[PDB]
């Protein structure tokens, strides 16, 4: 554009959309609103735990968990690891991060935070998947 129609209509930027849009909304219960405070984690109670199959050339069945968080919104959340302890009504700490080759789930679960316990036998990549030092 020329210099006059760029003074008269300035350079508006291109907005950046944040992934994990459920972790950056709070819920004031005394006013029933949605605040914005950019939380790194947010805990929640679980609703359904089943298995979901990938849609890629991959072929498996992945363990997800439908969790409603501190704010009253529903997500789907993946469980990393081997074994879990996630029947229903358990309190788990939702970690951000998308898992691809799975539709409609883009969050993890911190393995070992509130009520989920760590994996049964890892000793290699041990800090994530959350188990303590053996012996």
């Amino acid at each position: 554009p020329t210099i006059n129609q760029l003074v008269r209509k300035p350079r508006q930027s291109k907005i950046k959309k944040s992934d994990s849009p459920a972790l950056n909304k709070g819920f004031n219960s005394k006013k029933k609103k949605f605040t914005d405070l950019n939380s790194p984690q947010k805990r929640g109670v679980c609703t359904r735990v089943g298995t979901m199959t990938p849609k890629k050339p991959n072929s498996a069945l992945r363990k997800y968990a439908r969790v409603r968080l501190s704010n009253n919104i529903e997500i789907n959340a993946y469980i990393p690891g081997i074994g879990h302890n996630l029947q229903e009504h358990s309190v788990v700490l939702v970690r951000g991060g998308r898992v691809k080759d799975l539709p409609g789930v883009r969050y993890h679960i911190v393995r070992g935070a509130l009520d989920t316990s760590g994996v049964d036998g890892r000793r290699q990549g041990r800090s994530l998947y959350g188990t303590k030092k053996p012996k």
Binding site: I3, N4, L6, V7, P10
Partner: protein
């Protein structure tokens, strides 16, 4: 000390001793650096309905004489 000494151009002589001059100057733009004219209607206090529409008027600021006029007349450089 001394007070500000602006010059302008009348816009609407309404009734009862008030004229409004139009001081026009050139603010520059922040980012692109292009000069651009802008206006500022300064209400001012005519003594006895002297100046008419079309005149260029030198003015000076004073104490607040009403709710919106803060300036007074000193001298008329040209008229119509």
């Amino acid at each position: 000390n001394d007070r500000k000494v602006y010059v302008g151009k009348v816009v609407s002589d309404k009734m009862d001793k008030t004229i409004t001059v139009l001081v026009e100057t050139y603010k520059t733009h922040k980012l692109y650096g292009k000069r651009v004219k802008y206006s500022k209607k300064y209400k001012t206090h005519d003594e006895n309905n002297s100046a008419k529409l079309g005149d260029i008027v030198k003015i000076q600021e004073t104490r607040p004489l009403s709710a919106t006029k803060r300036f007074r007349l000193v001298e008329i450089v040209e008229e119509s």
